[PDB]
Design an enzyme around this catalytic site. Sequence first.
Site, PDB file in Angstrom:
ATOM      1  N   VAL A   1       5.038   0.189  -0.247  1.00  0.00           N
ATOM      2  CA  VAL A   1       5.585  -0.778   0.681  1.00  0.00           C
ATOM      3  C   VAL A   1       5.064  -2.149   0.233  1.00  0.00           C
ATOM      4  O   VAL A   1       4.052  -2.390  -0.244  1.00  0.00           O
ATOM      5  CB  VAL A   1       4.404  -1.036   2.443  1.00  0.00           C
ATOM      6  CG1 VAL A   1       5.163  -1.549   3.169  1.00  0.00           C
ATOM      7  CG2 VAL A   1       4.121   0.663   3.257  1.00  0.00           C
TER       8      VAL A   1
ATOM      9  N   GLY B   1       1.584   5.589   1.519  1.00  0.00           N
ATOM     10  CA  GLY B   1       1.654   6.464   2.339  1.00  0.00           C
ATOM     11  C   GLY B   1       2.677   6.743   2.447  1.00  0.00           C
ATOM     12  O   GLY B   1       3.996   5.962   2.173  1.00  0.00           O
TER      13      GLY B   1
ATOM     14  N   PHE C   1       6.641   8.611   2.154  1.00  0.00           N
ATOM     15  CA  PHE C   1       7.424   9.513   0.355  1.00  0.00           C
ATOM     16  C   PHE C   1       7.416   8.111  -0.733  1.00  0.00           C
ATOM     17  O   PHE C   1       8.208   7.815  -1.411  1.00  0.00           O
ATOM     18  CB  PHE C   1       8.618   8.972   0.990  1.00  0.00           C
ATOM     19  CG  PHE C   1       9.048  10.597   1.698  1.00  0.00           C
ATOM     20  CD1 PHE C   1       8.026  11.247   1.036  1.00  0.00           C
ATOM     21  CD2 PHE C   1       9.963  10.997   2.174  1.00  0.00           C
ATOM     22  CE1 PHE C   1       8.599  13.104   1.505  1.00  0.00           C
ATOM     23  CE2 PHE C   1      10.234  12.477   2.297  1.00  0.00           C
ATOM     24  CZ  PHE C   1       9.569  13.277   2.315  1.00  0.00           C
TER      25      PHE C   1
ATOM     26  N   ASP D   1       0.792  12.038  12.236  1.00  0.00           N
ATOM     27  CA  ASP D   1      -0.936  11.486  12.142  1.00  0.00           C
ATOM     28  C   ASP D   1      -0.831  10.624  12.605  1.00  0.00           C
ATOM     29  O   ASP D   1      -0.171  10.429  13.627  1.00  0.00           O
ATOM     30  CB  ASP D   1      -0.735  11.922  10.405  1.00  0.00           C
ATOM     31  CG  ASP D   1       0.404  10.150  10.100  1.00  0.00           C
ATOM     32  OD1 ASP D   1      -0.156   9.846   8.974  1.00  0.00           O
ATOM     33  OD2 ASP D   1       1.303  10.217  10.447  1.00  0.00           O
TER      34      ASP D   1
ATOM     35  N   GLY E   1       0.889  -1.424  -0.226  1.00  0.00           N
ATOM     36  CA  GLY E   1       0.266  -0.233   0.024  1.00  0.00           C
ATOM     37  C   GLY E   1       0.903   1.306   0.184  1.00  0.00           C
ATOM     38  O   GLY E   1       2.343   1.496   0.184  1.00  0.00           O
TER      39      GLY E   1
HETATM   40  O1  LIG Z   1      -5.088  -7.505   5.082  1.00  0.00           O
HETATM   41  C1  LIG Z   1      -4.204  -6.073   5.540  1.00  0.00           C
HETATM   42  C2  LIG Z   1      -3.394  -5.341   6.314  1.00  0.00           C
HETATM   43  C3  LIG Z   1      -3.105  -6.276   7.513  1.00  0.00           C
HETATM   44  C4  LIG Z   1      -2.224  -5.721   8.473  1.00  0.00           C
HETATM   45  C5  LIG Z   1      -1.294  -4.758   8.220  1.00  0.00           C
HETATM   46  N1  LIG Z   1      -0.819  -4.331   8.729  1.00  0.00           N
HETATM   47  C6  LIG Z   1       0.615  -5.044   8.809  1.00  0.00           C
HETATM   48  N2  LIG Z   1       1.008  -5.889   9.465  1.00  0.00           N
HETATM   49  C7  LIG Z   1       2.770  -6.621   9.485  1.00  0.00           C
HETATM   50  C8  LIG Z   1       3.020  -5.579   9.008  1.00  0.00           C
HETATM   51  C9  LIG Z   1       3.328  -4.572   8.423  1.00  0.00           C
HETATM   52  C10 LIG Z   1       3.766  -3.682   7.697  1.00  0.00           C
HETATM   53  C11 LIG Z   1       5.436  -3.484   7.776  1.00  0.00           C
HETATM   54  C12 LIG Z   1       5.877  -3.078   6.762  1.00  0.00           C
HETATM   55  C13 LIG Z   1       5.677  -2.370   6.633  1.00  0.00           C
HETATM   56 CL1  LIG Z   1       7.084  -0.975   5.626  1.00  0.00          CL
HETATM   57  C14 LIG Z   1       4.628  -1.208   6.304  1.00  0.00           C
HETATM   58  C15 LIG Z   1       3.650  -1.983   7.181  1.00  0.00           C
HETATM   59  N3  LIG Z   1       1.179  -3.756   8.238  1.00  0.00           N
HETATM   60  C16 LIG Z   1      -1.608  -3.860   6.719  1.00  0.00           C
HETATM   61  C17 LIG Z   1      -2.497  -4.499   5.836  1.00  0.00           C
HETATM   62  N4  LIG Z   1      -4.798  -5.422   3.715  1.00  0.00           N
HETATM   63  C18 LIG Z   1      -6.089  -5.752   3.462  1.00  0.00           C
HETATM   64  C19 LIG Z   1      -5.688  -6.573   2.064  1.00  0.00           C
HETATM   65  N5  LIG Z   1      -4.732  -4.858   1.196  1.00  0.00           N
HETATM   66  C20 LIG Z   1      -4.580  -4.932  -0.049  1.00  0.00           C
HETATM   67  C21 LIG Z   1      -3.660  -5.721  -0.248  1.00  0.00           C
HETATM   68  O2  LIG Z   1      -2.490  -5.481  -0.163  1.00  0.00           O
HETATM   69  C22 LIG Z   1      -4.008  -4.594   2.578  1.00  0.00           C
HETATM   70  C23 LIG Z   1      -4.311  -3.854   3.809  1.00  0.00           C
END
Ligand SMILES: O=C(c1ccc(Nc2nccc(-c3ccc(Cl)cc3)n2)cc1)N1CCN(CCO)CC1
Length: 541
Positions: free
Chosen positions: A14, A9, A11, A130, A7
């Site tokens: 990810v 966010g 600069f 934020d 996703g």
């Molecule tokens: O299901 C999630 C989700 C589930 C959990 C999260 N949160 C999460 N957890 C572990 C590492 C990270 C993470 C690890 C490293 C970085 Cl640099 C930025 C974020 N973020 C963020 C999103 N979705 C649904 C499917 N989405 C669409 C496809 O990407 C994304 C968001």
Amino acid sequence: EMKERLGTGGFGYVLRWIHQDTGEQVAIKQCRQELSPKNRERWCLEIQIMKKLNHPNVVSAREVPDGLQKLAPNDLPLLAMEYCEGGDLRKYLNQFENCCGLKEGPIRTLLSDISSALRYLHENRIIHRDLKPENIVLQPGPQRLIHKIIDLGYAKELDQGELCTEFVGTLQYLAPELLEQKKYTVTVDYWSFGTLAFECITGFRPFLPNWQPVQWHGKVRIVVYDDLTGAVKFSSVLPTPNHLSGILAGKLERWLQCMLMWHQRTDPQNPNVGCFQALDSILSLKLLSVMNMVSGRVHTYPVTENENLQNLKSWLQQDTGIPEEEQELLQASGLALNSAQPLTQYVIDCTVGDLIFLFDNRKISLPAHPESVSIVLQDPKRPLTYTHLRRVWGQIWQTIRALKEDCARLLQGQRTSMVNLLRYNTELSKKKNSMTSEREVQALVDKMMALQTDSVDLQRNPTLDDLEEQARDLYRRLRERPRDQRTPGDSNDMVRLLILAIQSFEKRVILIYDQLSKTVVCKRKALELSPKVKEVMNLMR
Ligand SMILES: O=C(c1ccc(Nc2nccc(-c3ccc(Cl)cc3)n2)cc1)N1CCN(CCO)CC1
């Protein structure tokens, strides 16, 4: 090469690179363009900053995963992090059936996590400009599920510089401080966090329906509630249709009511400590909970160790109500409270339960039900019931749900007082088959297999739950209704579902009293007619 994206966010992007072989969880922040020049420095301010420190409410770094390491569309480095497992706090906030926001304790988890997250940051001068439910992970936890603050693309270091200058993505939340782009101190995180909690409880705020720039002076034109047309509202003084306790709605109307503003707002009554122990006090609080079976119903208590049953009694007394010597206080099934033992023992707060309390009399049967005002006229009318029923329609069932959770919490309010029979019955029943082998053998097996009769009726017995499923569907068939075709000002189906939930809360209710009173005379004049058969059916020798 390694796997898919995650996703936007800050600069850049990810990435979710699930390692080729060993199966590690790697997440990379990369730069979008070449986006020079001082932002090219400030990005390297950030990277060093995200490495600097760590604690289990915000993620830590990872360094360099040499599957390719730096492939890159830049002549500029990357930052890598641990990927974790429960998603965004929003993805959860989004759950259909988690409508009306949370009725939780995971709220508790939330606050006390994000707090300890945020503190860290300001103690370390890192005002996280934020805070997004989108930047927060409900991480799976063995003991108790974990929260981890993420996305540091927008922070003020105070001592070395800033991070971005963009409002990228969805602004939606955040304080005047940045909205007006004026000068600022930490005060902003309190906003975001506060407005985060507000959502964490309600599902909304004052507020987000009317976009933003654009509501910028729905700024109570200010500590107050607000207006509608049909039914919109932008308020912080008192939230509406959602449970948590009766005294965390304490907190809110005081915690939120403080830290939900601009430029020095801290709790006007006290040079205390804001984001800090202000919260945790009104959080850590040890909660007792008496259920009065006179259906004067729920009570609630802030109890220490220096307070035992002795103290508890006096309270039940001066509430709703009645003196001490008609007070049966049963800890779940069985035991009273024992006794000069502190209440600090019967609370228990969240991992994977209640004080019910009874009387000494004949039986009286009271209904009287919980409700919200923005549901009052919603049945007696179809009043230009517009596009948004993701307020009312959901609420409908969350009011119906509350009723379930009440009969339920009176099934275990009453059939927790018949184990007071089953034990007392048999203890004082078959002690009279070992001390009854022996003439006046009249009132032995006569008042035994007749007030066992008025005991066997109730110990096996069975609308409203058959109704929760019909709510379960419809007030979901709205989000499951496509983006088109929706809008017609229509109510209809919800009405009957509520009244039928009421038509059960007027049968389930009184006919738990034909379980109650048939165990309050079959406990007195059943187990008090024993002392004249105990040691009066003894002296014949
Ligand atoms: O299901 C999630 C989700 C589930 C959990 C999260 N949160 C999460 N957890 C572990 C590492 C990270 C993470 C690890 C490293 C970085 Cl640099 C930025 C974020 N973020 C963020 C999103 N979705 C649904 C499917 N989405 C669409 C496809 O990407 C994304 C968001």
